[PDB]
Every structure is written in C-alpha cells, then in structure tokens.
DNA sequence: GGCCGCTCTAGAACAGGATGTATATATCTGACACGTGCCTGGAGACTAGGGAGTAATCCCCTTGGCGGTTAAAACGCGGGGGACAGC
C-alpha cells in the first residue's frame, strides 16, 4: 500500500504542511501521533517536494497570465500560494 | 491639501468531514445431479445328481345316521343392590 495515497492523506499532508511547513522534519511524528495515515516516508516526501515544485509552477503560470487551487493527482484539495508562503514563513 | 485606491474586517455561501443508518450486493452453505473409473457380481454356458412329481394300492379315519337318556338351557318372577345423576 506505501506507494499508494490515498485522498484523506492528500488532505491530511495539505492541512499538515499549512501548519508546519516542511514536515519532512517531523514526518515521522505526523505518523506515529496518527495525523498522517501511514505510508511511505519517501513517497510522502516526493509527493511533498512535486507540490512544491508545482506550486512553483504555478507561480510561473501567473507570471505568464499578468505579463488558487490546483489539484495533486486530480484531487482539487491544493492550492499553490498558500503552502509556498506558509513554508518559508514558517522556516524563517 | 484633497480624493481615490488599497487593505482589512464582516457577512454570506459552499464544501468537506464526521457519524449513523439503511439498502443492495456478494458470499457462503448445502444438496443434488452428473460424470468417471474401478471392481465385483451377475450373466452365460455346461454337467450330474437329487428331488420332485406321478401313479397305484391299501388302510384308517371321518362323516353320517340312529336311539335313548340326562343334564343343561331357557323361560319366568321378585327383590335387592348397584349404578347413575346430582350437588
């Protein structure tokens, strides 16, 4: 099942990362206290690191547009700005 | 010095998650039927001896009749006891 993942743990890494920014830090306490159900560390963090790099691209879509949800694996659960901001934020 | 734009707050809407309940669908459970394979019994064939069947004769038993006598059965009558209904 570890590579798998399924819509509640898409929900519950979105929600986690809104709270605490690059869980992969505290990942493996996210598991074991149950907020995450488990999986894979790697595949969390790969995951992790591809919303990254798609809230990136989304950003490069703006800019395109000019001169917000978006889904992971079709679930809509996902927005770029949010993450991207609360991440650095939370790091500094 | 003035006005408009930008930012923040407030309200409203929508969606998702959480929880409980109902309904539909799947799975199990069991028995019957059919198919397959193997083994055993039945079927077929042949012979010899014994049992059954057939025939005759004789003897004993059973059936039928007669007569008389005796006991049993049938008819009769009255009274008592038991059975039946009630409470």
């Known amino acids: 099942d570890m590579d798998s993942i399924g819509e509640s743990e898409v929900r ?3 929600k986690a990362i809104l709270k605490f ?4 830090e505290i990942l493996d306490e996210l598991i074991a206290d149950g907020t ?3 999986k894979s560390f790697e595949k969390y ?6 919303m990254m790099e798609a809230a ?3 950003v490069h879509e703006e800019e395109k547009n000019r001169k917000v949800l978006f889904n992971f694996k079709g679930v ?3 927005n770029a700005e949010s993450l991207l901001s609360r991440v650095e934020d939370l790091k500094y």
Request: net charge negative.
């Open 12 to 14: 519950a890494l979105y």
């Open 21 to 24: 920014g690059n869980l992969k």
């Open 36 to 38: 995450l159900p488990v």
């Open 45 to 50: 963090g790969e995951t992790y690191d591809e």
């Open 56 to 58: 990136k691209d989304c």
């Open 76 to 78: 809509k659960s996902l």
